[PDB]
């Protein structure tokens, strides 16, 4: 009858950078989503492959909680079938995703006068990520035929960049905290049930 540790993921003081997105495995617990939708700093919740109305009455092998910060107008990329810098190069959901995406404006926490540069994203990559692939390499990106040998220069770019959130940003450029809940149904005993 132990409730799942949802708060540990939603109430964190600092979130992960999206390219380095954090995963927490959740299992052997009772999933009370009301501790989540009564959170107050709880703003949006959209599920795929399952209805929220059915969640209290389903069981899953595991629940993974992936968390990171992106900017507001990038949240639409955290969805099946999307493209763009985040879905292509930073965090990719499968087309047949089963789970829920939770997001809220974190301008009061994650922006700073003069800019918060702690949150990073991958800007350059040669190919799209597979679903749930994580790439944390910092290799100098070779944009032409000349090898970089670790040296930054023309056609040789550091692959990451900072958001630099400022409180005066328009809402599309403000930080959003995101938690992705993946509901795993393997051929195994179910350890996460919500009653």
């Amino acid at each position: 009858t132990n409730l799942c540790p949802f708060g540990e993921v939603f109430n964190a003081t600092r979130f992960a950078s999206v390219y380095a997105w954090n995963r927490k495995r959740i299992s052997n617990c009772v999933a009370d989503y009301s501790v989540l939708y009564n959170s107050a700093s709880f703003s949006t919740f959209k599920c795929y492959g399952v209805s929220p109305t059915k969640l209290n009455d389903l069981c899953f092998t595991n629940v993974y909680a992936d968390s990171f910060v992106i900017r507001g107008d990038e949240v639409r990329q955290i969805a099946p079938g999307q493209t763009g810098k985040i879905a292509d190069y930073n965090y990719k959901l499968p087309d047949d995703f089963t789970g829920c995406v939770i997001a809220w404006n974190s301008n009061n926490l994650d922006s700073k006068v003069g800019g918060n540069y702690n949150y990073l994203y991958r800007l350059f990559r040669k190919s799209n990520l597979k679903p749930f692939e994580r790439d944390i390499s910092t290799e100098i990106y070779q944009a032409g035929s000349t090898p970089c040998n670790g040296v930054e220069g023309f056609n040789c770019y550091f692959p990451l960049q900072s958001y630099g959130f400022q409180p005066t940003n328009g809402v599309g450029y403000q930080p959003y905290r995101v938690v992705v809940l993946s509901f795993e149904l393997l051929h195994a005993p179910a350890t996460v049930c919500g009653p």
Partner: antibody, heavy 116, light 108 residues
């Protein structure tokens, strides 16, 4: 480092045209590659981009009529333009986009004239 | 909504050696996501400034960019004869790529 556009010319409204952009000194398939156009006497207008990973995006004014593509073995970018209209009359520039660092490399563009 | 960028002055006359400042205004806060381009008639634009204040490599040091949020400026310390051109600002890090509609800098 060179970007060299070709394929511009005179068209009637409703006809189609394919532009090419041949690159030397950067790898088209490894970059954000954009087309940006400029109508006679007007400002710059972004048209389309293709990501290194293959995603494509389009200005609303060309969605459904323009298709961007590339050929890695030729190191060449393309813009297929269908159902051309008066408002597509412009010089079309090919550009390498570094997205945070701006568009640092441009060709000198190819002219599309739509007969009145 | 979409960001819109607006440039002023629309046209400006100035003399060789003058100091000129031109501005770009964003319809909402865009941090430092602004680039400046110089364009001679019929030529490709040339990148001058990215991230609102970082000089592109090889650009003369009389060009400088300033600003954050919604108000951005491009300053030329001491105008040279080759500096007369139309200048454009561009929203960075977004593919619905948005441009200003230009400031035309003419000789006085």
């Amino acid at each position: 480092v060179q970007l060299v556009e070709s394929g511009g010319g005179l068209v009637q409204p409703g006809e189609s045209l394919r532009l090419s952009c041949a690159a030397s000194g950067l790898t088209v398939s490894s970059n954000y590659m954009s087309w940006v156009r400029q109508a006679p006497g007007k400002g710059l207008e972004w048209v389309s981009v293709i990501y290194a990973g293959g995603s494509t995006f389009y200005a609303d004014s060309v969605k459904g009529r323009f298709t961007i593509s590339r050929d890695n073995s030729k190191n060449t970018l393309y813009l297929q333009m269908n159902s051309l209209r008066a408002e597509d009359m412009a010089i079309y520039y090919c550009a390498r986009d570094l997205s945070y660092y701006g568009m640092d490399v441009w060709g000198q563009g190819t002219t599309v004239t739509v007969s009145s | 909504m979409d960001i819109q960028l607006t440039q002023f002055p629309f046209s400006l006359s100035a003399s060789v050696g003058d100091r000129v400042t031109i501005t770009c205004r964003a319809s909402q806060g865009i941090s430092t996501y602004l680039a400046w381009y110089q364009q001679k008639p019929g030529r490709a634009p040339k990148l001058l400034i990215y991230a609102a204040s970082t000089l592109q490599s090889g650009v003369p040091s009389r060009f400088s960019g300033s600003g954050s949020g919604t108000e951005f400026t491009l300053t030329i310390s001491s105008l040279q004869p080759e500096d007369f051109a139309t200048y454009y600002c561009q929203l960075l890090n977004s593919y619905p790529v948005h441009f200003g509609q230009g400031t035309k800098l003419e000789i006085k």
